[PDB]
């Protein structure tokens, strides 16, 4: 094929390795060419022909290279990001897009003017559970939701753009801006629970959309979790527990090959509740495979077809603008509007 | 029995007739002596030998009445128990206490002065569900909590008021015989339903530090999560259902047997605990609800000085927490507790 996107990667660690180098080597829309790293062995073994760099220029610098994957540290992205943007590349960007909205502001202008794509890897939007959801909202099986409430929690009691605000809340607030676009105020507390907490590992955000209220939540300190999803409509509920596989499966060193990618366990299907009138029927629904496959499906069609984005820059620039009022409210105390 | 305690009740709507009629009805050591109804005929049936009366003072100049029931409806159920503590008798007030914290302040210090025992119908302390709760916490089951989470929805789609002062009341009650008084209070108090004139939606946040203690519940609702989610160093346990012995009690069932309060196994909570790297669930089978034991108590303090199973104070702090969430919505900021 004459016409694979020709790739380089920037960063061979858990990202690099588990998150994207696997799936990128299924799609035959795509050659993985250069990778930035030192990890030159594991990429002979993983990637037999891509070829280990470790100057940021082999890739800025290579003319053949179309798009580039940022997986960096969340400290030296920024820069690299820029740096691609400045070379003429298409950029995808792991969540969180940067630390705040006026950095992420800045990249996009500088991808506008420089007529390049650049995307956030807001890849929960193709999580089963979020799949599912989609599914009966546009089914209308989940009319006129009034309140929204997702938890996303761990039991980590131990102290191993930081804290699970940024790397948790990113992906459920995401979801949220995807579903009901942005609200009109948000009230939050962010604080470290445990003992000897130097960043958050507690959060609790509402999402203020008048009538609707979206209600996002996680600690860390939470031995059994309740369900991740509950959303209560004018007629049905849907209420869910557990959390989409792929991930796991990706560390698990297995590769997206049939079709039972992304496939939900039978125990942790959602259950739809609705009420016509008098009778109140709960229905248990199968969860639509996840399918992170997609996202990179749809940002080869932007960069060949000139299709819309999968994720924009934008939306990547909304989370953080939600991100940073949350603290605001947190520091404050009180409700943070938004223009 | 010489001893009985004589009670009159004020008011026979659904309170006096369903929720005190019939628990006070299966306890000898009380007796109902006077109801301040129009509903002679309904007394006459349920009650032959309580004697109706139409005006309060045939209540409050008895000398033989002891204790009085206030069912009467949220506003005049100030004045009247004012009368009944004037008057030198033990009052139950029903939930909520007051409006106003202020409204609340001057019933204690007027039952302090007058020497008579003020209380709280609070009887969700004896919810089957919250006393499996206070269990666990009892046998080191639940140490160190640091998140505490609790709904209370209904599905009524169609239109001292609202649910917030109904039903936060209850929970917020709870929350409180747990833990104290929090540090502040978050809230967002609303009607999210298209007519509603009265709040019908609220979710309140409890600062207690690392603690966190969240209660909330709307009126749009088809299917409840969990009414419990409480999380603590080594476990959590979660929680469906409500309590059965108010719809007992409506469906004309009485306390008789080892059966009452009973919770359906379906709606056992779960207990999870994590040792070091071993996690294991047990279903906790719930303790009965025990509504009566709130008159027990209250006939153990009168006769025998004993402290109240709900004081006026306990009473006054739920009101407190309803104000400053009520304000909190207002302001739309964080209201700090004196």
Known sequence: SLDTIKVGI???????????????????EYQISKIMTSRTEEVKRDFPDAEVVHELEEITNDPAIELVIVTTPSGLHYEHTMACIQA????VMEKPMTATAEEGETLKRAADEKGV???????????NDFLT???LISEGSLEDINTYQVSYNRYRPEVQATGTLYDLG???IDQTLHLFGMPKAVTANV????????????????????????????????????????????????????????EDALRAGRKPEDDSWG????????????????????????????????????????????????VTAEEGINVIRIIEAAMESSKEKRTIMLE
């Not at 960063?11 to 299924?26: A, E, K, N, T």
């Not at 509402?206 to 991740?228: C, E, F, H, M």
């Not at 029927?281 to 639509?288: A, M, N």
Request: aromatic residues 12%; hydrophobic residues 35%.
């Open 10 to 28: 920037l960063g061979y660690g858990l990202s690099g390795s588990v998150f994207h180098g696997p799936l990128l080597d299924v799609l035959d």
């Open 88 to 91: 003429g590349k298409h950029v």
């Open 117 to 127: 794509l650049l995307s956030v890897y807001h890849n929960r939007r193709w999580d």
């Open 133 to 135: 959801i989609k599914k």
């Open 170 to 172: 990113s992906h459920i």
């Open 191 to 246: 604080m470290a629970q445990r003992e000897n907490a130097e960043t958050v590992d507690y959060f609790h955000l509402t999402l203020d959309y008048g009538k609707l209220q979206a209600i996002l939540y996680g600690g860390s300190i939470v031995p059994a979790n309740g369900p991740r999803y509950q959303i209560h409509g004018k007629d049905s509920s849907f209420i869910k527990y557990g959390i989409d596989g792929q």
């Open 263 to 310: 496939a939900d366990v039978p125990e942790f299907y959602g259950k739809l509740t609705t009420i016509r009138g008098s009778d109140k029927k709960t229905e248990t629904i199968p969860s639509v495979n996840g399918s992170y496959l997609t996202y990179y499906r749809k940002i080869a069609e932007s960069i060949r077809e000139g299709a819309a984005l999968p």
